[PDB]
Amino acid sequence: EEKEILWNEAKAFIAACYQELGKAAEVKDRLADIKSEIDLTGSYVHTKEELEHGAKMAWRNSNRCIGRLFWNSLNVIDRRDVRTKEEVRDALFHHIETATNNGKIRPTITIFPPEEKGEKQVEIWNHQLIRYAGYESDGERIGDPASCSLTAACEELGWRGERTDFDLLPLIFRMKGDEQPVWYELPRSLVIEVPITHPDIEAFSDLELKWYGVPIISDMKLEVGGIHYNAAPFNGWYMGTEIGARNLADEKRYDKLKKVASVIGIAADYNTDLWKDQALVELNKAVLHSYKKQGVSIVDHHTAASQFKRFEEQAEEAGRKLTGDWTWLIPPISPAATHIFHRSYDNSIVKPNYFYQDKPYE
Ligand X SMILES: Nc1cccc(CNCc2cccc(OCc3ccc4ccc(N)nc4c3)c2)n1
Does 154 qualify as catalytic in the annotation?
no
Alpha-carbon distances of 231 from 35, 111, 169, 186, 350, rounded to whole Å: 25, 7, 18, 19, 20
Pattern 202-241, Cl ion, x by CB under 5 A: -------------x--------------------------
- Tell which residue, 239, 221, 241, has the closest CA to residue 230: 221
Alpha-carbon distances of 9 from 22, 295, 323, rounded to whole Å: 20, 42, 20
Cross-strand pairs, 128: 217
Q: What backbone phi and psi angles, to 5 degrees, belong to 192?
A: -85, 135
Asked if residue 77 lies in contact with residue 107, where contact means CB atoms within 8 angstroms, the answer is no
Chain breaks in the chain (C to N over 2.5 A) after: none
Does 17 belong to an annotated binding site?
Answer: no
Is residue 15 a contact residue for ligand X (CB under 6 A)? no
- Tell which residue, 13, 28, 23, has the closest CA to residue 58: 13
Catalytic residue from among 183, 242, 275, 282: 242
Does 237 qualify as catalytic in the annotation?
yes
Q: Which residues, numbered 158-177, are part of the site for ligand X (CB under 6 A)? A: none
Distance, CA of 77 to CA of 232 (rounded, Å): 10
Asked if residue 299 lies in contact with residue 255, where contact means CB atoms within 8 angstroms, the answer is no
Q: Which residues, numbered 85-114, are part of the site for ligand HEM (CB under 6 A)? A: 107, 109
- Choosing from 289, 296, 297, 352, the residue that interacts with its own copies (CB under 8 A) is 289
Strand ranges across the sheet with 353-355: 227-229, 221-224, 353-355
Q: Which residues, numbered 291-350, are part of the site for its own copies (CB under 8 A)? A: 292, 300, 302-303, 306, 326-327, 330, 332-337, 341-342
CB nearer ligand HEM, residue 67 or residue 114: 67
| Window of 67-75, 78-86, 92-100, 194-202 that interacts with ligand HEM by CB under 6 A | 67-75
Is residue 244 a contact residue for ligand HEM (CB under 6 A)? no
Does 68 qualify as catalytic in the annotation?
yes
Which residues lie near ligand X (CB under 6 A)? Answer: 215, 217, 236, 238-239, 242, 246, 327-328
Which residues lie near Cl ion (CB under 5 A)? Answer: 215
Which residues lie near its own copies (CB under 8 A)? Answer: 245-246, 249-250, 252, 257, 271-274, 276-278, 280-281, 284-285, 288-289, 292, 300, 302-303, 306, 326-327, 330, 332-337, 341-342
